[PDB]
Amino acid sequence: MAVNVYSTSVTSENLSRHDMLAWVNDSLHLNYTKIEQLCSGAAYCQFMDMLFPGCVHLRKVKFQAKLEHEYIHNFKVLQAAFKKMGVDKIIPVEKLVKGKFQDNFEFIQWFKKFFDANYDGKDYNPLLARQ
Amino acid sequence: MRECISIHVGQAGVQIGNACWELYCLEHGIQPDGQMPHHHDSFNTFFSETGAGKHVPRAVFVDLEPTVIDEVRTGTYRQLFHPEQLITGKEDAANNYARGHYTIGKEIIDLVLDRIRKLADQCTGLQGFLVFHSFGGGTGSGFTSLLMERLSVDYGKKSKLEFSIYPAPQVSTAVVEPYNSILTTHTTLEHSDCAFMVDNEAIYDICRRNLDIERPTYTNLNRLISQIVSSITASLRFDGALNVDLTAFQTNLVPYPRIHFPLATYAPVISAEKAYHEQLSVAEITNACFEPANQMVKCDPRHGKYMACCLLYRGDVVPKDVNAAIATIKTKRSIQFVDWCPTGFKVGINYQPPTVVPGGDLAKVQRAVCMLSNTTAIAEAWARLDHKFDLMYAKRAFVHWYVGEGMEEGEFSEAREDMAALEKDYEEVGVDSVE
Amino acid sequence: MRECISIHVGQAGVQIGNACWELYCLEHGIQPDGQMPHHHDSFNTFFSETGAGKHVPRAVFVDLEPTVIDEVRTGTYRQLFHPEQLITGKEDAANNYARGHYTIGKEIIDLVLDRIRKLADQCTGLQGFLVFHSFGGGTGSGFTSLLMERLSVDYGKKSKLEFSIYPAPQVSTAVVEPYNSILTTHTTLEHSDCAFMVDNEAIYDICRRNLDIERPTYTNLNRLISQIVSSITASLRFDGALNVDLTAFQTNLVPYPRIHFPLATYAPVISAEKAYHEQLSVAEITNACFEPANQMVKCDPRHGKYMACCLLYRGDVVPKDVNAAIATIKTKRSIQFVDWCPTGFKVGINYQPPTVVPGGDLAKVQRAVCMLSNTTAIAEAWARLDHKFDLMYAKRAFVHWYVGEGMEEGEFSEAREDMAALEKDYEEVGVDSVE
Amino acid sequence: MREIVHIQAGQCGNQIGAKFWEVISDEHGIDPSGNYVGDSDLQLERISVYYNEASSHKYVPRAILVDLEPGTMDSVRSGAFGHLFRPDNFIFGQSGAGNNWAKGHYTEGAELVDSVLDVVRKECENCDCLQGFQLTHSLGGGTGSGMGTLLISKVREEYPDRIMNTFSVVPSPKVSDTVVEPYNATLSIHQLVENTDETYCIDNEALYDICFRTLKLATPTYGDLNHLVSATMSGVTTSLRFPGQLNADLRKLAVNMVPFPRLHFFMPGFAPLTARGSQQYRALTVPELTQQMFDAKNMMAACDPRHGRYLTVATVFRGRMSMKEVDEQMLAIQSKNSSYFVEWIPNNVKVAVCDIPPRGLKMSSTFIGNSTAIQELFKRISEQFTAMFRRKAFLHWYTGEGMDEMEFTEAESNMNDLVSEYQQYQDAT
Amino acid sequence: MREIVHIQAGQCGNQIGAKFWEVISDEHGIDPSGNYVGDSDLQLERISVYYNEASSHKYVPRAILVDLEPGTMDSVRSGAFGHLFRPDNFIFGQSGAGNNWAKGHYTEGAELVDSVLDVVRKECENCDCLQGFQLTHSLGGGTGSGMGTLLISKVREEYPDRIMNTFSVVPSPKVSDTVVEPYNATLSIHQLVENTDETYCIDNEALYDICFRTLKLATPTYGDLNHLVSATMSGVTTSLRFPGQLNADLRKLAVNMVPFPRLHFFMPGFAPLTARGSQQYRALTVPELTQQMFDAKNMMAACDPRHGRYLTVATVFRGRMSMKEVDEQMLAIQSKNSSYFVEWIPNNVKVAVCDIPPRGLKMSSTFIGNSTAIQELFKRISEQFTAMFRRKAFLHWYTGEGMDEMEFTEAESNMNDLVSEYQQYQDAT
Ligand SMILES: Nc1nc2c(ncn2[C@@H]2O[C@H](COP(=O)(O)OP(=O)(O)OP(=O)(O)O)[C@@H](O)[C@H]2O)c(=O)[nH]1
Ligand SMILES: Nc1nc2c(ncn2[C@@H]2O[C@H](COP(=O)(O)OP(=O)(O)OP(=O)(O)O)[C@@H](O)[C@H]2O)c(=O)[nH]1
Ligand SMILES: Nc1nc2c(ncn2[C@@H]2O[C@H](COP(=O)(O)OP(=O)(O)OP(=O)(O)O)[C@@H](O)[C@H]2O)c(=O)[nH]1
Ligand SMILES: Nc1nc2c(ncn2[C@@H]2O[C@H](COP(=O)(O)OP(=O)(O)OP(=O)(O)O)[C@@H](O)[C@H]2O)c(=O)[nH]1
Ligand SMILES: [Mg+2]
Ligand SMILES: [Mg+2]
Ligand SMILES: [Mg+2]
Ligand SMILES: [Mg+2]
């Protein structure tokens, strides 16, 4: 089981764009420079992998995604993972897939909150999971 | 010139036939006396034409107890039917598959086959048979199994659709429904080109929730099933922006030959008092369709997978809104598709809006939608029956009625292993493959 | 194209909804039957449109006791509402936050949420929710707390404004109001994007002084609150020389996330007999607003500081006169701003004058003003509640009712420390900085 | 179509049959003279099930009356509703069996069995396609018991695949109306378990209790008890003689309620039942009838059903009702009563619904219950049998007619095997 | 929705219930026959709370009549407003409890408790959403006291989360209508404090004083006292059966009025009360009613409230009135009366307002008061109990029915614990 959280209005706990970008870059060892590139959903899938062993199957997700239907399929995988872990935060795939700043940043800040909620302290190599 | 005949077996079959043919007579402007005081000959599908303006249906009403057939004969739709296709037995099978398949069904099967052949021989482009029967009664189950055998042996490859009354999980009217259900399913699994499950409890819930009829009767359920069937046959019987045939139904909905059990859903279902207050957009009705409450089987799809879906729209339907609605449905969370099917939607469009029956319960709308989905959660239902069967088979209950009527215990056994094999097939389809 | 839905919880919520939607129907020229025999589609905000000319509101009326909902159903505004959003329970929470949040509130929360999601899914530019509830009744407090939790979990960033009936200092109608108020405040502190306090005693005093109604009823208070809400939504619903949106309200009035409790005031409030004898200049009405008597909370702002103020004018309003009035207000002695905020005034202007309801108490005027102030004196009110709470918590009074319905004593405790922390935060914000 | 021959044996059989035919005549709107005076074609569309069309538009019942004393036959002939029966069917003896089962099954019954079977064969030949037979008799008197057992044996040997109903009055537990009813009941139940497809046990004590408590009749005459029994008969058969949203017949009930060939002994019940003054103070809805049935006080068998388990339950309805409400009530009464129903029969309730109410009443019902509680009944009789067979009480009377003690021993052994059979299926899991 | 089953026990309960159902019939406009002859749909929109709609548009009370002597039932049946009751609810004994609590709770009550609970169970199954139970009885006679205690125990054990109202006549301080009422009252109060959510103490001496002084009735018959009790009961319930600007029900009053589970003994009051001639000389406005209630002479309990403290006060209003005036009077009567109200309950007044006045009167109200003054009552009874238990007066009568001295000792100890509990919360600061 996994616990869930929300994000309504909190001060001193909202992180900057560059800070969260560095967080994802360091936690998955890559070089994103634009936060809206997280519309790919690969980062979220690997994040779910690192949060819970198994719980996903990275063979279906396409890290080389460059089209919209690919984004939709990756988000279908993410939704399946969310259902499996019992986290009930419905995700707005329709706005996310267009790759715009607003909903991408909203989803990633909520996801940072949820990640801080359900992380233990394990270490591993993101590359072996990625390949 | 595009013909498709109907076969109504059992009391449920006859009552749904009353509803469906009332709906048809209303749709094509046919008086009960068969006269005619978005349209092509649209009626040429169901209605054969005589020398005068009289039109008669191409349907067969067969039932071993003459009660319902007498009610049809003495009812308002008396002059309409040709007196031959109102076939009666003498004694009912009495919830006994053995009596309805070996002892009594044999005594009138030849006449039914002869009448069916007479109907077919004067057609030109017969597509297939619409079989309306229940799994509960012995008549329905056994006689439908026998008739499917005979039709498959006689007619090689014609689509044979079954719209069965699947036994409900908890709301039952009989006691021996499990035996009859397993026997008829095991028998028809090799002949049913596509079988559409519908359940009584779910339709009760829909009527209570949406129609706001605190005390509905079988008339309303028959009306809903008739609306479903009319939506299915609208493409054949009417002009459409995107037409669809029966073979299309049989092809797009059946990935594996043994798994051919879709379930039906209709929308919108709202009363005249509630007919206003909402515009009934295509996105709205599609959302209502994919909602698990509006489905007509007590099986929740959210714990399974959608192998295929076929949505038929009728009325003033604009296709771009269809595309947008389908995309939004695909984006949602409660619809996760199986790995091997990346594209599980078929769409059909017809210009003819649904027809409202005077004295009915629904309201005249401008758009309508039928959802025919082959999903995985339905397998769960089968398990329930199996459990019941094993319980009733633990102490050899009610077995003597079948044994002393021309049945072997090995038949019950082989039905049980075949049913377990079907469950295993459903499970293995459910799982995902490597790489 | 700019949608904003309303959620009315509790009997007070339903009555204020009656008043507000009567006011809206008069504003947009809508008959009670939903037909329509400075204006843009202005009504598209609150009123969704069907195929015909019928318009239905985007609001949800929920209450566990069916009395007020039956009165709405059988009232004059019968045909208007869609029958689904009139949601009733079976038994009332009976001034018990436990019953309204753990025991009974769970039994219908899913249906309410489903109706809200249907309402939202057909909108295009939904800004947020207008929640009308009281802190006194168990239904209002508990169900509103649960609903805000669930909406925040389900919808990420939508402004959620609460126009609550804060319990009065001395004129109280129940006995267990402080428990429910502390519990609901502690619960909603982290979901309420902005909460607007209004008190019954102050509105009674205003009615007796200004309206000259010696014996007013709740109808009048609902009329004033509806006028406040209409003034708030005028910018969205109408053309204006200087428009303001809900996010602007949430931004300019909340300096710190925990301190988001402004209070409301309306002007002018004068009878038809007194409609003459004064020209109601903008300076005059602004002076009336900043007068401590016309405020709708039993708190004297002259004993605290003004962190922020938002003035909305509607009607034939000249902006230079607005500037002169604001400067004169800033010059006075009873208005000292807090050290860290040198500019605490926001101004909005709308061309549409306020709408006079037939049979009402106010008089048709040409200019109107709504004042929304986030000040410091309101914190004093909290202290009173705390004291009351502590008194009734000294002897463990009424605790068993909550204990036996799914509540823990630690929840009461943590609510108490959270309220004390909120008071400490208010006090810290009150003081000035060094250097 | 689907014709039924009704046979009555004994004074009890004749009286219940007469009142039953009165009830049927009211249902189908027939004068005592036999002419049709109804007002709906539904009454006539299936008149042939019980009535034969003589010439001149006249209807005669398809009933056979059998007794050994002329008193009952004379009473039936003299009273009203008596000119309708066709005269030769009034087959009767002269001396009476004298409350002795041997004379009713071996000595005296042998002198009229041939004539009864000639009438039966003539009626069967005259019918279109016979459905089955129903017998109304009692197990207390010698005449009804012995003659009915003999008739059932000979008929079922003459027609193997037909179905045969018996409505047998079982002796009361508290008081005994006769003295040697143990032997008669034992032998009759033996014959019934061999050659009957179902039986409805009916007890006079239970009927008295129902009449006194529920009906609030302080002076219950036998006519009222026969009225309830006839109403039960009509409610059972109504699914065959009239249309319904869910049609059934005798065969469906027999198949659903009999999981094992020996276990075919049932309990009847009727609803609604109200006092004369207490009728308008109650709304007659489906749940009201459902809660009226599933209780001891409305069961015509002298055994509390809660002492045992419910194996199957058939419920027939009459009157325009919503089927879903019927179904919901059945589901609720099964779910809240999981303890008293057998687990290895999931969904153990059969439902049938007709369309014609039974007069004055806008809707009513009928209850058939296959439960193991009746086994207590058997044991009681068995014990009494032993108590009267260990010392050879009255045995020489049946010995003087040619019957042997071995026959009594086999009957007792078979009944005890039946009791153990009920016990085992009650203990099944 | 929110249906209430009303039970009356004893002769007192029977009479107050007859008057109560008369008052309710006038409020909802129902004939003696049970037909609707009202003129506003508001009367029928919530008829289901007390009335069950039988067939043919007829309404019957949802009331149960219990006694052990047939005289009261015969009196109820014979007089007007008697045909509307359902006769099966007419549950009565034959001998009468003989003013003995043991026979009313152990010996005689055991012979009818099963039937009463079957009727209760049927009514509970039939209703849509049960709200709670209200019992009208007395603590002086053996029948009402014992049978009511038994019924409350059994029902609350059958329904834990429902609420139960008891409207018990408490013996007068000056005169005693019976001789052994101390024991009966002690045991009954023990049972009530065990298994009741609230109780309204009512005293005959207070009612006599109210009738003689305020009503100016020199010849007060029992009918008038029962009329005031029924009017109070209807004023309590009116917040549920009709709309109002501030709706309440039994649950809200119970939650607001009970700070501690044991402390649930209240006093009722009614207003306005005027003589026949003195009615037009006074304006019926809110402050007049408010000043009429908060005084000793308008309290139906035989204890001056000024001897103690007011813990909580519930006030229900009926009639179109301005809420601000109501609130102003409540604030003023609390502010000028700071001494008699508990300090550690700020705002200890519950207010409810309906919209339908009570039959003629332009507006009226109802007062419920949770105050510690009633503790004096208990002490007096306790003292009398000791005065009759130290020497074992009449003890052998209750000893001869199987109950032993230990129940007397336990009940006395529990009542004294309740008295000390009241005293401690009275002395709290
Ligand atoms: N939804 C629906 N189901 C029906 C209707 N009529 C009958 N049924 C179903 O049919 C079942 C009863 O068995 P049937 O198939 O009708 O039996 P039969 O056709 O009369 O044949 P016999 O069993 O020999 O009497 C019930 O369980 C119902 O679920 C109907 O009008 N609507
Ligand atoms: N200003 C104003 N306040 C109201 C109005 N109606 C109710 N209230 C407030 O509501 C409080 C009563 O509790 P409610 O919130 O109405 O309780 P409820 O919504 O009926 O829910 P329950 O407590 O379970 O019955 C009072 O203290 C009033 O202050 C109204 O019309 N105007
Ligand atoms: N329910 C009911 N039972 C009856 C009625 N009259 C008699 N009985 C039962 O029928 C039994 C009478 O014995 P029968 O079977 O008729 O014996 P018989 O036919 O007269 O033959 P003999 O005993 O030889 O005279 C009694 O035990 C009664 O219990 C009646 O009117 N109603
Ligand atoms: N207010 C009021 N009280 C009454 C009235 N009639 C009787 N009482 C009270 O009820 C008590 C009568 O005793 P009950 O409780 O009725 O005893 P019972 O039910 O007759 O049972 P037994 O004492 O065994 O005969 C007396 O103490 C009276 O105080 C009445 O008309 N009005
Ligand atoms: Mg049939
Ligand atoms: Mg409420
Ligand atoms: Mg005889
Ligand atoms: Mg008495």
PDB file of C-alpha atoms and ligand atoms in Angstrom, chain E residues 9-16 66-69 72 95-101 103-104 137-146 169-172 176-178 181 184 202-205 207-208 221-227 229, ligand 4:
ATOM      1  CA  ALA E   9     -47.960   1.485  28.552  1.00  0.00           C
ATOM      2  CA  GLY E  10     -50.304   1.535  31.524  1.00  0.00           C
ATOM      3  CA  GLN E  11     -53.609   3.331  31.963  1.00  0.00           C
ATOM      4  CA  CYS E  12     -51.821   6.683  32.133  1.00  0.00           C
ATOM      5  CA  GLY E  13     -49.881   5.901  28.973  1.00  0.00           C
ATOM      6  CA  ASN E  14     -53.049   4.776  27.213  1.00  0.00           C
ATOM      7  CA  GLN E  15     -54.948   7.951  28.081  1.00  0.00           C
ATOM      8  CA  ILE E  16     -52.125  10.365  27.234  1.00  0.00           C
ATOM      9  CA  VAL E  66     -50.074  -2.242  25.809  1.00  0.00           C
ATOM     10  CA  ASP E  67     -51.775  -2.946  29.136  1.00  0.00           C
ATOM     11  CA  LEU E  68     -52.695  -5.860  31.394  1.00  0.00           C
ATOM     12  CA  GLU E  69     -56.337  -4.960  32.118  1.00  0.00           C
ATOM     13  CA  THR E  72     -58.490   0.797  29.248  1.00  0.00           C
ATOM     14  CA  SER E  95     -55.405  -9.853  35.280  1.00  0.00           C
ATOM     15  CA  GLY E  96     -53.479  -6.587  35.568  1.00  0.00           C
ATOM     16  CA  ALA E  97     -50.094  -6.203  37.253  1.00  0.00           C
ATOM     17  CA  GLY E  98     -51.800  -5.207  40.511  1.00  0.00           C
ATOM     18  CA  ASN E  99     -49.585  -2.140  41.049  1.00  0.00           C
ATOM     19  CA  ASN E 100     -46.566  -4.468  41.403  1.00  0.00           C
ATOM     20  CA  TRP E 101     -43.414  -3.741  39.404  1.00  0.00           C
ATOM     21  CA  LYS E 103     -45.293  -8.681  37.907  1.00  0.00           C
ATOM     22  CA  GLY E 104     -45.014  -5.920  35.308  1.00  0.00           C
ATOM     23  CA  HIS E 137     -46.005   5.603  30.604  1.00  0.00           C
ATOM     24  CA  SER E 138     -45.843   6.267  34.347  1.00  0.00           C
ATOM     25  CA  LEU E 139     -43.571   5.177  37.185  1.00  0.00           C
ATOM     26  CA  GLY E 140     -46.287   4.798  39.827  1.00  0.00           C
ATOM     27  CA  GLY E 141     -48.298   1.805  38.701  1.00  0.00           C
ATOM     28  CA  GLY E 142     -46.729  -1.603  38.337  1.00  0.00           C
ATOM     29  CA  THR E 143     -48.012  -2.237  34.809  1.00  0.00           C
ATOM     30  CA  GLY E 144     -46.704   0.854  33.048  1.00  0.00           C
ATOM     31  CA  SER E 145     -43.431   1.042  34.964  1.00  0.00           C
ATOM     32  CA  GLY E 146     -42.382  -2.601  34.743  1.00  0.00           C
ATOM     33  CA  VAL E 169     -45.264  10.555  35.116  1.00  0.00           C
ATOM     34  CA  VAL E 170     -43.263  10.979  38.329  1.00  0.00           C
ATOM     35  CA  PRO E 171     -45.126  10.696  41.667  1.00  0.00           C
ATOM     36  CA  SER E 172     -46.171  13.922  43.351  1.00  0.00           C
ATOM     37  CA  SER E 176     -48.888   9.726  46.835  1.00  0.00           C
ATOM     38  CA  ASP E 177     -51.487   8.099  44.601  1.00  0.00           C
ATOM     39  CA  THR E 178     -50.206   4.609  45.491  1.00  0.00           C
ATOM     40  CA  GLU E 181     -44.417   3.702  44.522  1.00  0.00           C
ATOM     41  CA  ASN E 184     -41.388   0.935  41.516  1.00  0.00           C
ATOM     42  CA  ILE E 202     -43.889  15.018  34.516  1.00  0.00           C
ATOM     43  CA  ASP E 203     -45.618  15.488  37.860  1.00  0.00           C
ATOM     44  CA  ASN E 204     -49.341  15.518  38.619  1.00  0.00           C
ATOM     45  CA  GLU E 205     -49.055  18.132  41.385  1.00  0.00           C
ATOM     46  CA  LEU E 207     -50.003  19.971  36.364  1.00  0.00           C
ATOM     47  CA  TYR E 208     -52.773  20.568  38.912  1.00  0.00           C
ATOM     48  CA  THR E 221     -60.380  16.880  34.755  1.00  0.00           C
ATOM     49  CA  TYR E 222     -57.726  14.383  33.689  1.00  0.00           C
ATOM     50  CA  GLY E 223     -58.542  15.182  30.066  1.00  0.00           C
ATOM     51  CA  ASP E 224     -57.073  18.666  30.422  1.00  0.00           C
ATOM     52  CA  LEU E 225     -53.843  17.390  31.993  1.00  0.00           C
ATOM     53  CA  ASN E 226     -53.459  14.838  29.206  1.00  0.00           C
ATOM     54  CA  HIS E 227     -54.189  17.628  26.712  1.00  0.00           C
ATOM     55  CA  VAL E 229     -49.007  16.665  27.987  1.00  0.00           C
TER      56      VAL E 229
HETATM   57  N1  LIG F   4     -51.371  13.125  34.021  1.00  0.00           N
HETATM   58  C1  LIG F   4     -52.199  12.114  34.262  1.00  0.00           C
HETATM   59  N2  LIG F   4     -51.801  11.077  35.080  1.00  0.00           N
HETATM   60  C2  LIG F   4     -52.642  10.046  35.339  1.00  0.00           C
HETATM   61  C3  LIG F   4     -53.903  10.012  34.771  1.00  0.00           C
HETATM   62  N3  LIG F   4     -54.517   8.883  35.183  1.00  0.00           N
HETATM   63  C4  LIG F   4     -53.673   8.199  35.985  1.00  0.00           C
HETATM   64  N4  LIG F   4     -52.507   8.911  36.096  1.00  0.00           N
HETATM   65  C5  LIG F   4     -51.318   8.512  36.865  1.00  0.00           C
HETATM   66  O1  LIG F   4     -51.067   7.154  36.568  1.00  0.00           O
HETATM   67  C6  LIG F   4     -50.926   6.367  37.730  1.00  0.00           C
HETATM   68  C7  LIG F   4     -51.838   5.157  37.585  1.00  0.00           C
HETATM   69  O2  LIG F   4     -51.106   3.962  37.718  1.00  0.00           O
HETATM   70  P1  LIG F   4     -50.714   3.108  36.413  1.00  0.00           P
HETATM   71  O3  LIG F   4     -49.274   3.325  36.017  1.00  0.00           O
HETATM   72  O4  LIG F   4     -51.650   3.464  35.284  1.00  0.00           O
HETATM   73  O5  LIG F   4     -50.975   1.589  36.872  1.00  0.00           O
HETATM   74  P2  LIG F   4     -51.805   0.587  35.927  1.00  0.00           P
HETATM   75  O6  LIG F   4     -51.379   0.735  34.487  1.00  0.00           O
HETATM   76  O7  LIG F   4     -53.287   0.830  36.084  1.00  0.00           O
HETATM   77  O8  LIG F   4     -51.424  -0.872  36.485  1.00  0.00           O
HETATM   78  P3  LIG F   4     -51.938  -1.339  37.936  1.00  0.00           P
HETATM   79  O9  LIG F   4     -51.445  -0.347  38.961  1.00  0.00           O
HETATM   80  O10 LIG F   4     -51.393  -2.711  38.252  1.00  0.00           O
HETATM   81  O11 LIG F   4     -53.447  -1.376  37.950  1.00  0.00           O
HETATM   82  C8  LIG F   4     -51.343   7.227  38.910  1.00  0.00           C
HETATM   83  O12 LIG F   4     -50.317   7.255  39.876  1.00  0.00           O
HETATM   84  C9  LIG F   4     -51.563   8.620  38.359  1.00  0.00           C
HETATM   85  O13 LIG F   4     -50.647   9.518  38.935  1.00  0.00           O
HETATM   86  C10 LIG F   4     -54.310  11.050  33.950  1.00  0.00           C
HETATM   87  O14 LIG F   4     -55.430  11.023  33.450  1.00  0.00           O
HETATM   88  N5  LIG F   4     -53.457  12.102  33.694  1.00  0.00           N
END
